[PDB]
Amino acid sequence: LHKVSVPALQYFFPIFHWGSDYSLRLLRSDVVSGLTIASLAIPQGISYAKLANPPIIGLYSSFVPPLIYSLLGSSRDLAVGPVSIASLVMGSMLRQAVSPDQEPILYLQLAFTSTFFAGVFQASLGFLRLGFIVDFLSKATLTGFMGGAAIIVSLQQLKGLLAWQTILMGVAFLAVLLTTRHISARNPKLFWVSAAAPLTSVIISTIISFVSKASVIGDLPKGLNPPSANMLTFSGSYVGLALNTGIMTGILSLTEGIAVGRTFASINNYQVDGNKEMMAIGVMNMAGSCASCYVTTGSFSRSAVNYSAGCKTAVSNIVMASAVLVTLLFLMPLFHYTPNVILSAIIITAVIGLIDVRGAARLWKVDKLDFLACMAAFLGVLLVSVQMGLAIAVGISLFKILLQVTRPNMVVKGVVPGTASYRSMAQYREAMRVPSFLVVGVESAIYFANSMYLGERIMRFLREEDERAAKCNQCPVRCIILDMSAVAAIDTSGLDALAELKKVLEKRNIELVLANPVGSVTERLYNSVVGKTFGSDRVFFSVAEAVAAAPH
Template sequence: MLKNLMPNDHWIAHYNKDFLKSDFSAGLIVAIMLIPQAMAYSMLAGLPPVIGLYASTIPLIIYALLGSSRQLAVGPVAMVSLLVFSGVSTLAEPGSDQFIAYALLLSLMVGAIQLSMGLFRLGFIVNFLSHAVISGFTSAAALIIGFSQLKHLLGIKLEGGKNVFLLLFDAFQKIGIINWITFAIGIGSIIVLIYFKKKFPKFPAPLLVVVGSTLVVYFFNLEERGVSIIREVPGGLPAFSLPAFSVDSITALLPIALTISFVGFMESIAVAKTIASKEKYKVDSNQELTGLGAANIVGSFFSASPVTGGFSRTAVNYQAGAKSGLASIITALLIMLTLLFFTDLFYYLPNAVLAAIIMVAVFGLIDVKEAKHLFRIKQSDGWVLVITFFATLLTSIEAGILIGAGASLLLFIWRSAYPHTAELGYIEEEDIFKNVDRYENAKMFKDTLVFRIDASLYFANLAFLEERLRKEISDKDAVNRVVLDFSGVNAIDAVAIDELEKLIDEYKEAGIEFHLAHVKGPVMDLLKRAGWKEKYGEKIEYLTLHQALQPSRGSFHVS
């Protein structure tokens, strides 16, 4: 069965032994990076740090066996961790046994959704989340994630929940009672992480701040001065267990499970395709869903929180020389060794350092350039980004992406309801027809209106089209013929056919005839089924505008 789930060109079937050194090196580097990240992201999700380490073992192996990307580094990521916290914290107290049980059930649900989508070839569904929506959502979520770590950075309790503005206001009010040692450790870690990220991006800076801060806390007994530390991290590999579930818990978790499934997959497929294009191989979106889904399902049986492919780790994996999924398997094995023998070393690790790792990672996701880019090219897309951004900040993670998707869908409907149309004129020098509003040398006919429609026709845009045609015809007293250029009409529905027929018959009684040119095959098939061939004959069968306009070629006037 496993072989049937694997892509035909899987790396296992064609593994080159010369890749072993590169894969081992990449696996080691990513493991060093992932250990502190996994613990930090688990803390962000409201889970014990060890859950993040569990999520960095079995799921990585399953994805490496079933996924189509050779370099994608799967594991806990900030966005998904925040979504887990956002969805599960409404049902149970973060960190509690019930919270952990819900999180593991969430992994199973996310995996089931993704695996089902992959097996049924439904990867195209995520395309309905536009880039503007994802960019706005990601930027807002990055702010929410980053500021949610203020309590660990400042060493104090903060009120305000997930609302960024209330959180900042409470932090400002409590500025006088912060733990300055904790703050110094956190800020110092941020400075070190940013410095190495800019100057030496391949250096495992997270490991440096983890080791350095742990030694400082241990030798100076800083936990006695109020510095919050990780303390006990259970050792050993995760045991097999079935996530507890009920109909009520599944119903309550379904909205957040769907959100994680889509958002996690989009983050994963975006970076996977980027790397694949550089390496000149193909990533299959449905196979990616299968791999991620299976990873989450199997992971849920071994106490793993939901996972997906991460931007930063994948970039590091690729830059470190990863050639295949073996690099991820090596990463998982090294983390298993850490769980077996080295968890005691994390006892004195400050929570402020994990908060710093999260902040540096997520604030890099805030994309101001993309907002400027969208506003420069098309303002409507820029406003969708802004709406999604503020909706996510002011409401919730789930509601924000739904509002953004809704705004994007409404924009699409509006554009399709008011399509672009153009009156065409003839440019003799080039023997071509062009929009008269864009080409001053395009000549119009005295008795003929040439009108191009640049969209498929359906019930929602026929009223607009009819209004545009009536206006154009009424503005030209001498018109006795209308030629519709259907070169941009890829589809037409029954309602549009009926309404267009009524319009043509109405103008025929007024002495104005309609002709159609450039009608595409699928559209012509529908027109013939509607009886247009018998009713209008050759008037709907002109292959070119030249044919349709042959009787009027000598009667130009300049607009």
């Protein structure tokens, strides 16, 4: 038998850590990325600024929030700026109380007060180490949401329509934007045809608007960021609208640049701090909200072209905000004859690409609580508002976690012949039961949610095999072993029901035995008063050493 043993300019500003080893060979590589990601910020930061209902606010949002993150950030391949989902939800939740055609100085004061409050929601969630709650946003919630929101904005934008040289132009240069996605989904080296097809859609349609001169978006104001917080309306009537939009774009614009600092960390093996990562983007917003920026966070699309044309570190986040230092000042009069429809298919390719219909139905034949969540975020945004299509699909994604912790699986086990290892009897048809014993595996953690369910379930198996004992004249159950290998945690109410089970099973001379615990259980089983009534003679190394010791 074996004994069950029991067990400041570099903290705040992390550019100084990795900045002391930047080479020229790296600087050969973090410029051809940031020539192309500052070729996808110029037609897809003015395009999803249109989707939020002015087009230069998406370019102010590609200069200072990339520069702030390069000082405070903890990834090196996360590339920043605006995104596509947060802009659409910004453009829907604000269109249905104000209108940018009617109150354009009060539509600019609401995509700023939301951004500042999408700044403190992302900063002071990661400052108080509370950034695990961005993981509750499942992949099936966001398939339902992004796709149940890409219809009710397709109605609100098609109420603003109610020409032959426009609609025959905006489908052919959408075809340079969807066939370059058909051919970039096949080969993961043909990103380069899609890495500038947002730019060669604009530039080739610039000259056809320059030789056929005259609904163009025109002369945009040359200059730096306007110093806002003179357009931050903290004290007014539209604050709840600019707080609900800043909560709702403070989660949709967090789970895209938290979950891209994780999917580009395991590829390259650098630990991204998560909560210190969340502190950065909440200073990308609330300290960028005063500089004509709206809600920014790292993109899913303009990161997988940063690490597809070989980025090496986060100075390609400065080649972002230094080759945008150029274009806000010099090529703005070239933008005077750049049309509106050419950047509206750039919205459209991030609408049809938002309705992932295959993944919307693939999760029907493999699960049916990650399918109810899709069709509760689908019909929760179509029928109820945007805030309740997310609240009831997170809420039934959190339910299938609770529906397995309540009512878990308790198997009956038995020794697999030829070895001293006790597996279940649902699997392993050949597994034999020991006559004087009963092995029962609790396959979840023992909480208040299921402490009273194990007692009513162990004594169903124990009742099952005291009436089956008389059928073959066998020895009945004289030791029930709890294979606690699968029990992850135990609380005070789960540890109590293990002591109210021992003294019920003592009154039938059954001798309940725990076997094979884990860490954070044995330090609760040997440091509480509900544990020294178990002690060392009922907590074993494995089942095979509990059967061998034979507690009787």
